Amino acid sequence: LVPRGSHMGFPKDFLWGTATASYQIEGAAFEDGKGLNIWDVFSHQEGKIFENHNGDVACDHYNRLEEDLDILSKLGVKSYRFSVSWSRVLPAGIGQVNHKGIAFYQMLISGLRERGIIPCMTLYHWDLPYALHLKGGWLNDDSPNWFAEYAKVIKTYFGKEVSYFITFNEPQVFVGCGYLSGNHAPGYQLPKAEIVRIAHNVLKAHGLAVKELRKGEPCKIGFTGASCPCIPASDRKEDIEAAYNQYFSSNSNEFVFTDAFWFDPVLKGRYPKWVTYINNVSMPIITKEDMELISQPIDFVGLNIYNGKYVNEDGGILQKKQGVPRTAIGWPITQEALYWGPRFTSERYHKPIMITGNGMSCHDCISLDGKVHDENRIDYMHRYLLQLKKAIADGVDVEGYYAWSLLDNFEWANGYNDRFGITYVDYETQQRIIKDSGFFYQQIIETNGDLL
Amino acid sequence: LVPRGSHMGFPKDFLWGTATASYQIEGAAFEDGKGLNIWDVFSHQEGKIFENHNGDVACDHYNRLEEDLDILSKLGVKSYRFSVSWSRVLPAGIGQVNHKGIAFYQMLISGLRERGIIPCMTLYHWDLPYALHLKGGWLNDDSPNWFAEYAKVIKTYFGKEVSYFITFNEPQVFVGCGYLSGNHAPGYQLPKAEIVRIAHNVLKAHGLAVKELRKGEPCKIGFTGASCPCIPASDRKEDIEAAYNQYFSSNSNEFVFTDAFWFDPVLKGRYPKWVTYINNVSMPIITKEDMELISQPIDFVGLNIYNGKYVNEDGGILQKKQGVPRTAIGWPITQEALYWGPRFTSERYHKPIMITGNGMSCHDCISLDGKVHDENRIDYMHRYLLQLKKAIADGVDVEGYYAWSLLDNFEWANGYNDRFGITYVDYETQQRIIKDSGFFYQQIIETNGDLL
Amino acid sequence: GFPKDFLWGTATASYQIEGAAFEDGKGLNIWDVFSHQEGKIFENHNGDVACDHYNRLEEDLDILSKLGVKSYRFSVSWSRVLPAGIGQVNHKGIAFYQMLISGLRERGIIPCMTLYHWDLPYALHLKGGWLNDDSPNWFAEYAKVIKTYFGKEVSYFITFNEPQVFVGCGYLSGNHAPGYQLPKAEIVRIAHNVLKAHGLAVKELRKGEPCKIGFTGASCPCIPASDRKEDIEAAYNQYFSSNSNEFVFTDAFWFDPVLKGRYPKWVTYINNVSMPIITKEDMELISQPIDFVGLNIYNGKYVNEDGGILQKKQGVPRTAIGWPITQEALYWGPRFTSERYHKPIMITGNGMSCHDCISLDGKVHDENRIDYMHRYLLQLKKAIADGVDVEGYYAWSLLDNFEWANGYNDRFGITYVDYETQQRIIKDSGFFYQQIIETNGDLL
Amino acid sequence: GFPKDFLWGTATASYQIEGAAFEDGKGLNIWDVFSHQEGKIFENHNGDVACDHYNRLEEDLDILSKLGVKSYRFSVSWSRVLPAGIGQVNHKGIAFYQMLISGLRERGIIPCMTLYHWDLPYALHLKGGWLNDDSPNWFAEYAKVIKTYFGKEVSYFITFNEPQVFVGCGYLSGNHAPGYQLPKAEIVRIAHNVLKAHGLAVKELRKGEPCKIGFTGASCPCIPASDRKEDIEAAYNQYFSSNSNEFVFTDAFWFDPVLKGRYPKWVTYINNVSMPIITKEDMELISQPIDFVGLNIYNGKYVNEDGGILQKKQGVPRTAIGWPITQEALYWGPRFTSERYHKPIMITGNGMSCHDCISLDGKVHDENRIDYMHRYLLQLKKAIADGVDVEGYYAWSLLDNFEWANGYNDRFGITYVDYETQQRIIKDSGFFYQQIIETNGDLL
């Protein structure tokens, strides 16, 4: 990369944001003609979620939109990343539009526009309509067409006021956890060939959705990966190369959670070489035309980075340091992940990057003073943003940063046991309390990160 | 029941048969334009089958048809129960017929007719076309229509020469093991509501297939259950009633492996009462019109019985006797199952019964004399047939008995480790050796079971 | 408020902090061997070095003095003082504890000595450990060594720490050393040998200098959902309940023998093959007079008359080890234990696992631990106001340390340890606690 | 053919047939306790009654006489003769074995006495069992009782049956009593104590009357791909291989100590915490001269030209317990064992689990067991023809019995037992075997 140098810091137009997802915050799961999604059904199965928690109510954001918009305004957030519930706007996944569903997102988007906040809309954040799951979901040859139909509804209803779209959030997780490990909806443990089939249908769906989102108003379109960057052993050229090679490695026995398996198709129009040689029973047939469809021009690469892994001089994984700083969900704190992830992604693809999710699970409580003190989240955010600022100085084009999350919410198979918010939610009363990290972040945004 | 008396013995036109299934014997899994089925894909998944056995070749019956037809003729079998590979005749499950697939079954059926052997054709013996699995399989609202299309192909191509059809073999097993326990293809562990959805689609599929099979030539149509009869503690009226009540019991926590859950819809046009009250997330909508479709008139009830369970005077399950006679697959030998299962099924439904499968897994070997001696299978068959003969004397209308199986074959998740044949197969050479039980059965058929 | 002579303390255990596992003639213990078995500990962590407290005694004594702690609860490594568990005393082992106790006395800090905090000598494990009929005699021999060498300068002893955990996790669930899953009869045999060992150790500790002797339970108090008499009764009954399918982790299974000289009723009706024979003489031995009941309380569970044990609240405040924060546990545990047994209570362990780290300012900020301690101590203060005799409170722990099967992944300290350098950094909670002790909790 | 003095036998074990588990002063053993733990045995079967052979001795002796068996291999219940494992002899226990041995002598049947067939006295288990440094001395005390009471009339002794199984299944996999999953160092400690126990027992059995002493391995012979010298060498090398990750179920790990006075080289270079110290003096003790090597062989494995284990053939002939039928195992196991150790071989156990039952004719037809026995004995006869010194063959088992964790679900007998009535029905295989013995196997 060509360095920028450390004097400028974050660019003038930098998108300081916070992020949520529909199922994690909305509730109103069975209201106003909304159709079932796979998380409604999965979360109601005994033993799938921590303490059989579910998203039936979550943060009740469907009913408490105005309060949450006021928090976004109070904290001076420039951009709000949210997902649309596919099943709320298309209860059967295709066909009849639910105008009460559309009306909710119209009220949200109007509220953002009134407050001068830039919407960043994720189309797919894991809540596949249940009607489409019954038709085989992502195993079905027609699943890309279902997604294209949804993307056309999105562009039709929201294309006037929304100029930032992300097709998919973390295919690594919804495919790997949903269909390989089985710990996420719909909870399957499928053979390798079926994981590649699902991946290929998701990637074709992405291509068709990009084509739908290009019809009409100009917009910026991205694709968000879950990334666990390899942090080199030193600044030696050879140690950096070994980390880069490990970061972008994949093979038939370890691919679904990798970066290159998903981003090489999207950005380079090719799978890793090993995909061409797999003969497993029922492998999908991957065509030149498929790869042209998948690799539609997009405007930014989304990275959701929480931590990375330290690698030795040869790219082998080092064991975690004894007593390494960690988070309430168990993950280690590895500040250099928000340097190396963006740097390596920039070097491989030469595309602008948005950090579409970064944050920390903390054991947050309301203290005797009635406040929510989260100094560990402040330290995490401070350390990670210093590393991102260094990546910008070293020539990475970073266009935005979205704190995961605006609200404490439903953390998937961990239920409500993990709190990622800069806003505390008391689920008994639905009270929002802005945490110390919210006010810390407000100050970062006001100063454009100049004082980090 | 109203008795017949013991003098007739087996009826003069009794169908003395043997049974197989397509995936268990055919092989040629990837030949002659045959489409994949779910067992091709499941059996190739690491750890799903004993020693990673699969049906790729099985008994190579696709190539060795003439030899197997000659064994049927040599043993004087009156009827041959076999299944058609849906994926062999319709590689995508619907649309284009594969004429090489049809040609195989035409050669089989011509061979049977030449030898004076009555074909008994199972449409579905668990090998769902993989193309339909990718569309959600039995979760898809359209799965009954897919099956109807297949049944129409069957009637169109085979209706002139085949007059005995069975729509489904053992829905208890392919739904319970395939989608609840996950030990059979496709290997899922689904919620209760999805098991009911699948069951309802299988039952509607049955109804549409009966309508297709009625178009054109007259025929006899059946539906085959897996049954584990409750054997009463004594001949006391109250002990018999308790066994009957347990045998036909079901509830929302234990239904998929039961008799009444499947046969009450097929024969009485109603589900067990408990199904009316279930509100679980995503329950299918069960209509009056659905139940009329499911309960199309059929000609016989198929029972596959290997053993039963002894119940106390109150219908509670008794613990197995210490050192109870058992089989090579681990199941107990309970001769009275082939009395009580037919008797109770006759009392509930008043329909003719065919024993569509009865037999024993034995640790068979080629002895030093080059023969296969299976006295334990002879004793099993002799004991069970005496009990069936007593059921006929006591007024059960039994129209046939099919020995499971003609050949040692692929026993599903147990691979080739369980040998049920009256014919031994050496898988190294594909040599067939008729076992002592084959000659024992030949003599039973010649004497119409008069000397049992 | 808190009594004038209230024992404000902090607590540790030998295996969790000492290190020096294989030197100065120390014998192996079951945790040395268990922690080296693949997959038994988080990331195969072990106590070989731990906080290296064996070698950093002076630094850690200075932290105790800096924070103004009135009492220090520690355990003696049985395998350090008796390498084979019985027979030859290791005088280098004795010398370490003599240096610690001299250091405490120099600083005006009251020693509180736990004899058994789970580090069974490996030599005794090879002889069947607590299954062996002679295991109470092994423990009595150890208690006699303790009284002989430390009886002059130590006046507070606890025989056993949390038999619920070392028996239940060690021999029923198998997640703690030695990692067994034994039948019910063997769990009762082990429990009965531990309880007889306790009785024999009390008799040894009574020989010579007068002292206060206790026995420490792991307790998860039942918190009545309200102050209604009915809810209180229901909570008390649940708290002291046990049955043959769920007893080893309960209060009454262990404390009824120690304090009342009887087992719960249900023990009478177990006839399983190999059940120990429990005699009148055994129960007299177990129920030696003791001076205080030790409670280690981290949290409780909410109970009502109508609901029984209530489901945990969605998003309940919790700790880094996953446990919920239930402030009223440090009211009701002491109160109900006081009402049942009429003995003084010592809180021998209370604290919180936090995801602590060194912030960019070089400090360790643990506001969640301060809030936890503030809330729990207000509840203990209310118990004292309502007439419960509480003699002391020991913060678990002085140091971040080896948290058993969780290895170093759980930090309970009021002092942070950087394991790379062994640097100690007193956390905000340490200074918070210093201020509580200086004011005797008057400003809570 | 077979030598004129060839020991044609059948074999049983105390816990598998005796019953009378809790009477005539018999002490508990580890199988009495393990079998009563929920879920350890198929359908919670146990040996409390088994074949009731303790009470039906005369009937079973008459079956041995009817079938013309030359030798009867049985085990002594350690807990029946020494209820606490050491100390007071139980003379009612001794009296049972004296009645058995007198019965055999009256019928001209040669006793072959197994001292240890897995029923460790429970009292010794409570003292750590084979982990205890003194476990070799406990076994020596038992062996001295055996020689004292039975040395006049018994001239064939086997110290241990299948250490591979009672150590590997008992303490590594945990599927057999006492049901543990111990670290590698503890498995080696147990193995070393068993081997020292063997050495001390041989010394006790040599005091007084002359006798033949053996040690019985569980063996799964490697069958070469062909009679090519290189294929044979590859099979031999695989058969006698072992390493730290796969040793407890091997031949060389146990037999190299007993016969060569060496462990495999890898053993002495393990430095795991708590490894036993293995001395020159220990290896001299373990490697006392013995008279025969006992092999219990049910099947083997086929190896390729390079000694790699081939996958089982699809549809391989197998038994009711799931094991394959591999006739050449009873050629190559004896041949390779003979070549490595230059000792006479006794096949102390060979037989087949079959799904036997009483047919409508009231008989028990077991043609698969006849074919198994005929095939395996032809291979043993070929080993003898090729110069292997084989002194005897013992059919496992005289009776259908308690097959350990499989309970009564596996029938290995040449005699069927109806457990409802305890009726014995000699199977077709019993009459087949009678004819083999009458003709000394000349007509196989």
Tab-separated table of C-alpha atoms in Angstrom, chain D residues 10-11 351-354 356 364 366 369 373 395-401 410-417 419 425-430:
chain	number	residue	atom	x	y	z
D	10	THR	CA	-12.860	-75.734	28.162
D	11	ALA	CA	-12.619	-72.478	30.169
D	351	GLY	CA	-14.676	-69.475	20.893
D	352	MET	CA	-17.581	-67.579	19.377
D	353	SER	CA	-20.622	-65.573	20.550
D	354	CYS	CA	-23.706	-66.912	18.667
D	356	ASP	CA	-28.270	-69.316	20.171
D	364	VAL	CA	-29.598	-75.899	20.526
D	366	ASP	CA	-24.983	-73.843	16.607
D	369	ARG	CA	-19.815	-72.233	16.235
D	373	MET	CA	-14.097	-74.209	15.917
D	395	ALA	CA	-12.844	-73.714	24.283
D	396	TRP	CA	-14.309	-70.421	25.620
D	397	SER	CA	-16.694	-71.299	27.220
D	398	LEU	CA	-18.115	-74.419	28.930
D	399	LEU	CA	-21.316	-72.414	29.651
D	400	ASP	CA	-23.192	-69.424	28.277
D	401	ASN	CA	-22.392	-66.812	30.935
D	410	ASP	CA	-23.578	-62.791	24.304
D	411	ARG	CA	-23.600	-66.624	24.474
D	412	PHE	CA	-20.112	-68.204	24.062
D	413	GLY	CA	-20.989	-71.617	25.539
D	414	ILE	CA	-20.755	-75.126	24.100
D	415	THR	CA	-23.561	-75.554	26.734
D	416	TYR	CA	-26.728	-73.392	26.562
D	417	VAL	CA	-28.070	-71.997	29.866
D	419	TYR	CA	-31.401	-68.366	32.941
D	425	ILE	CA	-28.519	-78.010	27.246
D	426	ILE	CA	-25.335	-79.221	25.529
D	427	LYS	CA	-25.272	-77.558	22.074
D	428	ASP	CA	-24.382	-79.346	18.789
D	429	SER	CA	-20.870	-77.776	19.225
D	430	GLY	CA	-20.428	-79.673	22.542
